[PDB]
Structure formats: structure tokens, C-alpha cells
Amino acid sequence: SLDPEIIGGQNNFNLQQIFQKIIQERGPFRD
Amino acid sequence: MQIDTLINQLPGISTAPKHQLEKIKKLQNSIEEKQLERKSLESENEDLKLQLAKRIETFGRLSCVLFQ
Amino acid sequence: ISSLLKQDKELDLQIQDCMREMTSIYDTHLPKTQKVNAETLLDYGRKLSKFSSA
Amino acid sequence: LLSKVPDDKSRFEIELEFVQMLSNPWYLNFLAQHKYFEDEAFLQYLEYMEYWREPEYVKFIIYPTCLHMLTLLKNPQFRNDISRADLSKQVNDEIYYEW
């Protein structure tokens, strides 16, 4: 039949992007 | 000749998938319960990590100030 | 003075080592930036098999 | 404001094929040259293309790239650089190598 199987791309193998995101989400860093 | 020898290399298998399917279901259940165990022990892990991290932070600021 | 300076350097290295080991044990990681039914999976993969293959 | 003239079945055949087009990088480059990315309607239609990631629907899509391509195109600076020919060749070459 059809049973749900759980697999999460375990075969396949950054803070600058984090910074840019937070920069757009709360504007300046200082606050 | 190569095709022949490869045909010999060929292992006979049941066209029926019941044995394989059952194996499959066993593995899925198995990884499910192992994943639950991992989750419990992982929450306890991160809590522990927070605790030790606080003690660390106390140490660092205290040490710096006192020696300097 | 030279002996006593050597003593200070050694003590500095001892505090080094202790902080190093605490921070190693607490490995610091950044935070991390559906289930599947096998039938629809297998059919999709076999479709894709001709097209991702040379 | 011309009255819409669409077909039901036909536009999901078509939207499938359009997603496929999005897989092609050269089509993205031409698309950018034609300044289709200037139109907001286009970008809303892109989000409408998000329906194609759903399992029953994605089960139909042939070229996986498009999906990736779509997430790539959500950055506008990327749109102006797929206007560029150099980057276009970079993208094509990147697939060609994965392939």
C-alpha cells in the first residue's frame, strides 16, 4: 500500500546571510 | 559471451515484493522510534548546554575582570 | 624576574587550557537555518530516471 | 480590461509547460531582456506557480530545475543579472556540469 516514510536528504552535505536577513527584519543591528 | 556471463551473474529474485515491502516497513518503524529517542535526549542535551553555557559566561567575565 | 615571568606565562596557559576545554565540550553551533509515501516517490523517480540520465 | 479567455484543463497543461520553460536559463535571460520582471502581475503569477511544488502537481513536472530556478528568481538582483549574458552562461554551464 502507501505508508508515509520519513527521510530528510541525509546523503547531501552562513552568518553573513543571517546578518543580511536580520538587517532587513529589524533594520539596524545596534538596537 | 559477456552477455551470457552477465546473465549468470544475475541473481534470481521473486517478482513479488512482499518480503521487501515488509523489510521496508520494519526499517521505517525502526528509524521512527530511534528518532523519538534522539528527540527526547536532544531536548535534554540542549537544556544541559544552556546551563553549562551560563556557568561559562560567569567564568569568562569574572576571570577577565579579576586578572585585568 | 625571568623565572617569575615564565611562571606567569605558564599560569596564563593553564587558564587558556581550562577555558579551551570547556568551550570544546560545549560545542557551539549556529541555529538551523513532510513525510513521504513511497509509491508516488518511486513513480516520480522512475519518470525522472530517463531525464536525469544520459 | 479585456475579458479573460482561459481554459481549465488547458491552463494546467500550459502552466506545467511554463514551469518547464522557467527551468531553461536562456529563457530567463530573454525574459529579463524583455523586462517582464518589471511587471508586478508577473511576480504574482510566479507565486501562482508555487502551486506546482505540491506533491500531486509536482508529480507531473518533468524538469526539476525550474523549481530551484523559481526560488532563485525570488531575488530581484538575480533578475537583473539574468538580464546579463555572462551570468546566463554561468548558470547554463552550472547545470551542464551537474548534468
From Swiss-Prot, chain A:
Localization (cell): Nucleus
Superkingdom of this protein's organism: Eukaryota
Subunit structure: Component of the Mediator complex. Interacts with med18, prk1 and rbp1.
Family in the record: Belongs to the Mediator complex subunit 17 family.
Function noted in UniProt: Component of the Mediator complex, a coactivator involved in the regulated transcription of nearly all RNA polymerase II-dependent genes. Mediator functions as a bridge to convey information from gene-specific regulatory proteins to the basal RNA polymerase II transcription machinery. Mediator is recruited to promoters by direct interactions with regulatory proteins and serves as a scaffold for the assembly of a functional preinitiation complex with RNA polymerase II and the general transcription factors.
Protein name: Mediator of RNA polymerase II transcription subunit 17
Residue window of the full protein shown: 17 to 50 of 545
Curated annotation (Swiss-Prot), chain B:
Predominant location category: nucleus
Coiled-coil annotated residue ranges, if any: 18-59
CC per GO annotation: mediator complex; nucleus
Listed GO MF terms: transcription coactivator activity; transcription coregulator activity
Secretion signal span: none
Cell compartment(s), UniProt: Nucleus
GO biological process entries: positive regulation of transcription initiation by RNA polymerase II; regulation of transcription by RNA polymerase II
Key words, A-Z: Activator, Coiled coil, Nucleus, Transcription, Transcription regulation
Family recorded in the similarity comment: Belongs to the Mediator complex subunit 21 family.
Subunit structure: Component of the Mediator complex.
Chain's role: Component of the Mediator complex, a coactivator involved in the regulated transcription of nearly all RNA polymerase II-dependent genes. Mediator functions as a bridge to convey information from gene-specific regulatory proteins to the basal RNA polymerase II transcription machinery. Mediator is recruited to promoters by direct interactions with regulatory proteins and serves as a scaffold for the assembly of a functional preinitiation complex with RNA polymerase II and the general transcription factors.
Protein name: Mediator of RNA polymerase II transcription subunit 21
Curated annotation (Swiss-Prot), chain C:
Disulfide linkage: none
Chain ranges passing through the membrane: none
Top-level taxon of origin: Eukaryota
Subcellular location: Nucleus
Function summary: Component of the Mediator complex, a coactivator involved in the regulated transcription of nearly all RNA polymerase II-dependent genes. Mediator functions as a bridge to convey information from gene-specific regulatory proteins to the basal RNA polymerase II transcription machinery. Mediator is recruited to promoters by direct interactions with regulatory proteins and serves as a scaffold for the assembly of a functional preinitiation complex with RNA polymerase II and the general transcription factors.
Family: Belongs to the Mediator complex subunit 4 family.
Quaternary structure note: Component of the Mediator complex.
Protein name (database record): Mediator of RNA polymerase II transcription subunit 4
Residues of the full protein shown: 61 to 120 of 239
Curated annotation (Swiss-Prot), chain D:
The keyword Transcription regulation belongs to this UniProt entry's keyword annotation: yes
Domain of life: Eukaryota
One GO term (biological process): regulation of transcription by RNA polymerase II
GO molecular function: transcription coactivator activity
Cell compartments where the protein resides: Nucleus
Primary site of residence: nucleus
Keyword tags: Activator, Nucleus, Transcription, Transcription regulation
GO cellular component, one term: mediator complex
Signal peptide: none
Assembly information from the UniProt record: Component of the Mediator complex.
Functional note: Component of the Mediator complex, a coactivator involved in the regulated transcription of nearly all RNA polymerase II-dependent genes. Mediator functions as a bridge to convey information from gene-specific regulatory proteins to the basal RNA polymerase II transcription machinery. Mediator is recruited to promoters by direct interactions with regulatory proteins and serves as a scaffold for the assembly of a functional preinitiation complex with RNA polymerase II and the general transcription factors.
Family in the record: Belongs to the Mediator complex subunit 31 family.
Protein name, UniProt field: Mediator of RNA polymerase II transcription subunit 31
Gene from which the chain derives: med31
